[PDB]
Amino acid sequence: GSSMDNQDGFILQQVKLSLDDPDSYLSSWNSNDASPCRWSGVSCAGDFSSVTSVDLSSANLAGPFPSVICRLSNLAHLSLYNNSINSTLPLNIAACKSLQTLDLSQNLLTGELPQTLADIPTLVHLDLTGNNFSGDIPASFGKFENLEVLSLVYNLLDGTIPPFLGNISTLKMLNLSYNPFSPSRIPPEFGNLTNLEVMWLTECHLVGQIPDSLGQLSKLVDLDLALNDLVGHIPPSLGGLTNVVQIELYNNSLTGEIPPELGNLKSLRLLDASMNQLTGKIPDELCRVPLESLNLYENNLEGELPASIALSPNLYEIRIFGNRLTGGLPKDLGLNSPLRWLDVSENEFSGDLPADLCAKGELEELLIIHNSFSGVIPESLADCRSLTRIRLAYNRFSGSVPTGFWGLPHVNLLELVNNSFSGEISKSIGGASNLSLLILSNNEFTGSLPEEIGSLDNLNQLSASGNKFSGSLPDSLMSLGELGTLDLHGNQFSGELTSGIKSWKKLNELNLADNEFTGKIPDEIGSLSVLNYLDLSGNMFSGKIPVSLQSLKLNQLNLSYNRLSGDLPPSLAKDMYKNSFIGNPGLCGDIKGLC
Amino acid sequence: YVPVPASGPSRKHN
Amino acid sequence: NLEGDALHTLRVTLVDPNNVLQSWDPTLVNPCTWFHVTCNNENSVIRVDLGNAELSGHLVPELGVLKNLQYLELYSNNITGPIPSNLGNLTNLVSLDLYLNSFSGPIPESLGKLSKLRFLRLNNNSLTGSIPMSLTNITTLQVLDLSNNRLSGSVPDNGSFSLFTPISFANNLDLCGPVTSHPCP
Ligand SMILES: *[C@@H]1O[C@H](CO[C@@H]2O[C@@H](C)[C@@H](O)[C@@H](O)[C@@H]2O)[C@@H](O[C@@H]2O[C@H](CO)[C@@H](O[C@@H]3O[C@H](CO)[C@@H](O)[C@H](O[C@@H]4O[C@H](CO)[C@@H](O)[C@H](O)[C@@H]4O)[C@@H]3O)[C@H](O)[C@H]2NC(C)=O)[C@H](O[C@@H]2O[C@@H](C)[C@@H](O)[C@@H](O)[C@@H]2O)[C@H]1NC(C)=O
Ligand SMILES: *[C@@H]1O[C@H](CO)[C@@H](OC2O[C@H](CO)[C@@H](O[C@@H]3O[C@H](CO[C@@H]4O[C@H](CO)[C@@H](O)[C@H](O)[C@@H]4O)[C@@H](O)[C@H](O[C@H]4O[C@H](CO)[C@@H](O)[C@H](O)[C@@H]4O)[C@@H]3O)[C@H](O)[C@H]2NC(C)=O)[C@H](O)[C@H]1NC(C)=O
Ligand SMILES: *[C@@H]1O[C@H](CO)[C@@H](O[C@@H]2O[C@H](CO)[C@@H](O[C@@H]3O[C@H](CO[C@H]4O[C@H](CO)[C@@H](O)[C@H](O)[C@@H]4O)[C@@H](O)[C@H](O[C@H]4O[C@H](CO)[C@@H](O)[C@H](O)[C@@H]4O)[C@@H]3O)[C@H](O)[C@H]2NC(C)=O)[C@H](O)[C@H]1NC(C)=O
Ligand SMILES: *[C@@H]1O[C@H](CO)[C@@H](O[C@@H]2O[C@H](CO)[C@@H](O[C@H]3O[C@H](CO[C@H]4O[C@H](CO)[C@@H](O)[C@H](O)[C@@H]4O)[C@@H](O)[C@H](O[C@@H]4O[C@H](CO)[C@@H](O)[C@H](O)[C@@H]4O)[C@@H]3O)[C@H](O)[C@H]2NC(C)=O)[C@H](O)[C@H]1NC(C)=O
Ligand SMILES: *[C@@H]1O[C@H](CO)[C@@H](O[C@@H]2O[C@H](CO)[C@@H](O[C@@H]3O[C@H](CO)[C@@H](O)[C@H](O[C@H]4O[C@H](CO)[C@@H](O)[C@H](O)[C@@H]4O)[C@@H]3O)[C@H](O)[C@H]2NC(C)=O)[C@H](O)[C@H]1NC(C)=O
Ligand SMILES: *[C@@H]1O[C@H](CO)[C@@H](O[C@@H]2O[C@H](CO)[C@@H](O[C@H]3O[C@H](CO)[C@@H](O)[C@H](O[C@@H]4O[C@H](CO)[C@@H](O)[C@H](O)[C@@H]4O)[C@@H]3O)[C@H](O)[C@H]2NC(C)=O)[C@H](O)[C@H]1NC(C)=O
Ligand SMILES: *[C@@H]1O[C@H](CO)[C@@H](O[C@@H]2O[C@H](CO)[C@@H](O[C@H]3O[C@H](CO)[C@@H](O)[C@H](O)[C@@H]3O)[C@H](O)[C@H]2NC(C)=O)[C@H](O)[C@H]1NC(C)=O
Ligand SMILES: *[C@@H]1O[C@H](CO[C@@H]2O[C@@H](C)[C@@H](O)[C@@H](O)[C@@H]2O)[C@@H](O[C@H]2O[C@H](CO)[C@@H](O)[C@H](O)[C@H]2NC(C)=O)[C@H](O)[C@H]1NC(C)=O
Ligand SMILES: *[C@@H]1O[C@H](CO)[C@@H](OC2O[C@H](CO)[C@@H](O)[C@H](O)[C@H]2NC(C)=O)[C@H](O)[C@H]1NC(C)=O
Ligand SMILES: *[C@@H]1O[C@H](CO)[C@@H](O[C@@H]2O[C@H](CO)[C@@H](O)[C@H](O)[C@H]2NC(C)=O)[C@H](O)[C@H]1NC(C)=O
Ligand SMILES: *[C@@H]1O[C@H](CO)[C@@H](O)[C@H](O)[C@H]1NC(C)=O
Ligand SMILES: *[C@@H]1O[C@H](CO)[C@@H](O)[C@H](O)[C@H]1NC(C)=O
Ligand SMILES: *[C@@H]1O[C@H](CO)[C@@H](O)[C@H](O)[C@H]1NC(C)=O
């Protein structure tokens, strides 16, 4: 009857008149309509013509919060997410007394939080993320009657984290991350949030110790206290987090040992306590938990990686680099898990690489630099086509590289530097369609550079210095137009450079020093547009230095210890070039000690 | 739109 | 690290049609495996090689955090804006090669703090003002090219500048001095 009539369409026409609508999101809002229910963003639950939800997210709407919308009596859900809503959020938002969901995230809202948000008794979900709100969190926020989600992430809140937020009994998610809060301790009272499933306090300028109270949060699923200045130990109390799946404590000043009590966390799958000052050994009890991801990099950890970690059927990520860990990697690592990212670099690990790291066919990153690993690359890795980044440098590895390993189709970086690797580069290198950086320096590699290296059109770096490579440069090498670095110094390369060098238009560094190259430096040397570093020293290059060299703007030139003859172009007869032409008996220039 | 990093593991790698 | 953070700051203020900075992953421990970046044995940046990459945009003062950088190669691009004063903080720089760009404003007097600089090529820009006298204090300077700018005022002929010839200061708006052969007021 009369009792149940409304002016919802009229209220909504006032919302429309109060907002800039450049993309005409509100054109459907036609006052000739019998009902606003069909309007863009509008839903009316029941046959009743009462508006129950307004979702204007991502509409490109601008202007202040339209407080007139509170005159919609049955409005339970309002979203202005991802708009240009601006100015202060008015204290008269509390007039919206039926609101269960309020999402004003990703807007240009400014000033202080209106304390009257606490005076909407029906409010379950409050999201103010990605706004410009500042000042203290109001004391009224301790009095929310039914709030389950409080999200104030990515604002300019500059007060201390309030203990009264622990007084919201119904709260399931406390998300305060990325606020320039005044340095504050985690309030012990947050342990009284018995229904809490998410505590997200990343980059909140938190200080002091993690309180033992937090162990009382039996329903917590995400504890995230990362990017803070928390000190003290990871508490053994955290073993009381019965339902926890993810613990993030990275980039803090935490000390002491990883508590074995983390082993009691049956649902724990992700733990990252990286970038701390943790000491002692990784506990076997934690490794027995079937973790999806364990990151403990840049700590002061010692001892052995427990073999139990290789039992997890869920492990895809282990990053424990920058520690003093010793012994062998678990023999069965990768055998029972889809390992994707392995980084054990900057450790004192030794022995052979585990044979089956890529058994499940998902390994992308193999990063083991600065360890004492020995033996041959496992033959299985030749079939690991998922790999994109390979860093085996600064180990004690020996033997041939498995044929197939050179041809992996998605590898972008292959770095075998500072090992005792032997044998040749296989013709299989042709299959490496994604290879950009090839770094083989300081090995015992032998043989000619295969012609298939020229098929690597996207190759940017070829560094193979300090090896026993031999033969003339393959003709295909000069077809590499994306090459910026060619370093073949300290090898046994022989033969002549050809006119094909003119195709190295992107080459910055040409280092062919300490080789057995013969013939003349090609006149096309001056046609290399971005060449700034040229080292042809310690070869048998003969003939006149090309006049084209004067075209280049080199920061480094050395043609010393060759069979070069003739006169120095007067531009090279400068004191700065005094150590660039040494050991060329035929060569006569106007430099002191030359000719 | 200021994109907000999700709650999750750090990603530093060699 | 800090050095990678500083170069990533350059990536985001630079316009990169060819995606030459794609490998510049700021989640890497350091920028040493980044294409166009070369590091020393201590994993510290000594070279940035971005010549003729069709880069547009402005440089950042954050480049001055690279304390071991020796070769800054940003030549043959369309980079606009001023030479950040903070480039004078690059204590180990040997080469400053900003030539063939659209750089405007004055040559920072801070550049005279580069005591190891040997190559200074700022030619083919829109640079204005006088050539800082502090440049004469770089005893290591061997190559200078300030030609094809809009520079004016006295050209120094003392310290490192005594050896320099007219081709170094050619095609400037109103340069005066002994090298110019036009005496100054
Ligand atoms: C909160 O946002 C409101 C909506 O604005 C738009 O969104 C914001 C976030 C920015 O992105 C704005 O750039 C964007 O426009 C702001 O209110 C609006 O304010 C503008 C003025 O900037 C109002 O315009 C006058 O509008 C009349 C009628 O349309 C024009 O005839 C008049 O004329 C000229 O416009 C030409 C354009 O070529 C200009 O060159 C010329 O100089 C004149 O300005 C004005 O533009 C606009 O109507 C108004 N929109 C709505 C829906 O109300 C709001 O700003 C504040 O209120 C206005 C009245 C003004 O006093 C302003 O200074 C206030 O700050 C803004 N509030 C805050 C706190 O930022
Ligand atoms: C936050 O909110 C943003 C709204 O402000 C939202 O933004 C935009 O993103 C959408 C989707 O990516 C863009 O989409 C389409 O619009 C095209 C028209 O637009 C443009 O041209 C102008 C030049 O005058 C230029 O300035 C703009 O940037 C655009 O390039 C349109 O052609 C396109 O068409 C099709 O897609 C629809 C979608 O269903 C389909 O039905 C059609 O058949 C057709 O296939 C899109 O409609 C929109 O342009 C962006 N607008 C603005 C203002 O940025 C953000 O994506 C949102 N963010 C999040 C995280 O949610
Ligand atoms: C090229 O290189 C030359 C050589 O280094 C530079 O010249 C010098 O410049 C510095 C400043 O940049 C001068 O420093 C100052 O010392 C003054 C006292 O100097 C005299 O007495 C001493 C001691 O006997 C002598 O050695 C010296 O030669 C002088 O006779 C101070 O009073 C100065 O100080 C004040 O101002 C500063 C702020 O700028 C305050 O912080 C101080 O508290 C103080 O009040 C100053 O410290 C130096 O004297 C110069 N030497 C010479 C030989 O000239 C050129 O400047 C440089 N660049 C250019 C563009 O040419
Ligand atoms: C307060 O903070 C918390 C914590 O930051 C916020 O919640 C967490 O919010 C995120 C973002 O929505 C949720 O996201 C994801 O997880 C769900 C659930 O599912 C899983 O199962 C699938 C099945 O294969 C698997 O792929 C997932 O990895 C996961 O194990 C996903 O459905 C969801 O979506 C996919 O996400 C992709 C990545 O963005 C998309 O590209 C896809 O298109 C697809 O949608 C997403 O991965 C977390 O689940 C959630 N965590 C918890 C413990 O609740 C919370 O939102 C925040 N609220 C406020 C208001 O600030
Ligand atoms: C990666 O592998 C490369 C190559 O194997 C490696 O570089 C080499 O490093 C050593 C030590 O850092 C270099 O040695 C110097 O070598 C010269 C010979 O050119 C020697 O004259 C020097 O001195 C000696 O005398 C000392 C007297 O006390 C002895 O203690 C010492 O053992 C020497 O006899 C000095 O050792 C070597 O020249 C380089 N080689 C090349 C090609 O650069 C590099 O260090 C490895 N990097 C890592 C991080 O492991
Ligand atoms: C050659 O090697 C390079 C370097 O390893 C390969 O490169 C890269 O590709 C990644 C995946 O395509 C890409 O990842 C991400 O970051 C993107 C934003 O910068 C983001 O949009 C992506 O999205 C999610 O991506 C996952 C991928 O599994 C999807 O499944 C989701 O649906 C999302 O879209 C990624 O987070 C990375 O940025 C890029 N790295 C570099 C340094 O360029 C390249 O693919 C290789 N090519 C070949 C042919 O193998
Ligand atoms: C901690 O959470 C408590 C539970 O929400 C909260 O108590 C509640 O406080 C409000 C506001 O004072 C009371 O609200 C209203 O009803 C009374 C009836 O006597 C009126 O006098 C008030 O004007 C108002 O309408 C709730 O009655 C009360 N609820 C319960 C169950 O006790 C505490 O205030 C919170 N404490 C802190 C420090 O934040
Ligand atoms: C977690 O709450 C404990 C229970 O307390 C209170 O009642 C709530 C419903 C709420 O109104 C809250 O404001 C009250 O603190 C609390 O213990 C307290 O009760 C004991 C008696 O058993 C009392 O001696 C003590 O002083 C009370 N504590 C406080 C802080 O006032 C418990 O301390 C709290 N957890 C913390 C602070 O970490
Ligand atoms: C070159 O000659 C310059 C001019 O006399 C001289 O310049 C200046 O240095 C003095 C003394 O430090 C300053 O008081 C004066 O402000 C400076 N003048 C200008 C124009 O900047 C240089 O220092 C001399 N260079 C060398 C290497 O001696
Ligand atoms: C550097 O700048 C000079 C001056 O603008 C450039 O020289 C001119 O080039 C045009 C052709 O583009 C000639 O027609 C003019 O005669 C030149 N002017 C002078 C004064 O020499 C020069 O090309 C630029 N250098 C480079 C490498 O591009
Ligand atoms: C964000 O808040 C600050 C401080 O309250 C204010 O000065 C600034 O204008 C606001 N920024 C935006 C983007 O509105
Ligand atoms: C760790 O925190 C410091 C600030 O305390 C910051 O500079 C650094 O970049 C952070 N690194 C990561 C990976 O979080
Ligand atoms: C060089 O760096 C210091 C900070 O260490 C700064 O104070 C100084 O002003 C910088 N110089 C320039 C010219 O920016």
Author numbering:
A (entry chain AAA): 12 to 606
B (entry chain CCC): 70 to 83
C (entry chain BBB): 27 to 211
Quoted from the paper:
Here we demonstrate that HSL1 binds IDA/IDL peptides with high, and CLE peptides with lower affinity, respectively. Ligand sensing capability and receptor activation of HSL1 require a SERK co-receptor kinase. Crystal structures with IDA/IDLs or with CLE9 reveal that HSL1-SERK1 complex recognizes the entire IDA/IDL signaling peptide, while only parts of CLE9 are bound to the receptor. Our work reveals that HSL1 is a receptor for IDA/IDL signaling peptides.
In agreement with our biochemical assays, the crystal structures revealed that all IDA/IDL peptides specifically bind to the peptide-binding surface of HSL1. IDA/IDLs adopt a fully extended conformation in the structure. The co-receptor SERK1 interacts with the C-terminal region of the different IDA/IDL peptides (residues 68-69 in IDA), completing the peptide-binding pocket using its N-terminal loop region. Superposition of the four crystal structures yielded an R.M.S.D of ~0.6 Å comparing 590 Cα atom pairs, with IDL peptides perfectly aligning to each other. Our calorimetry experiments reveal that SERK1 binds HSL1 in the presence of IDA/IDL peptides with a dissociation constant (Kd) of around 15 to 50 nM, indicating that IDA/IDLs promote a high-affinity association between HSL1 and the co-receptor SERK1. Taken together, our quantitative binding experiments demonstrate that HSL1 is a bona-fide IDA/IDLs receptor and uses SERK proteins as co-receptor kinases for high-affinity ligand sensing.
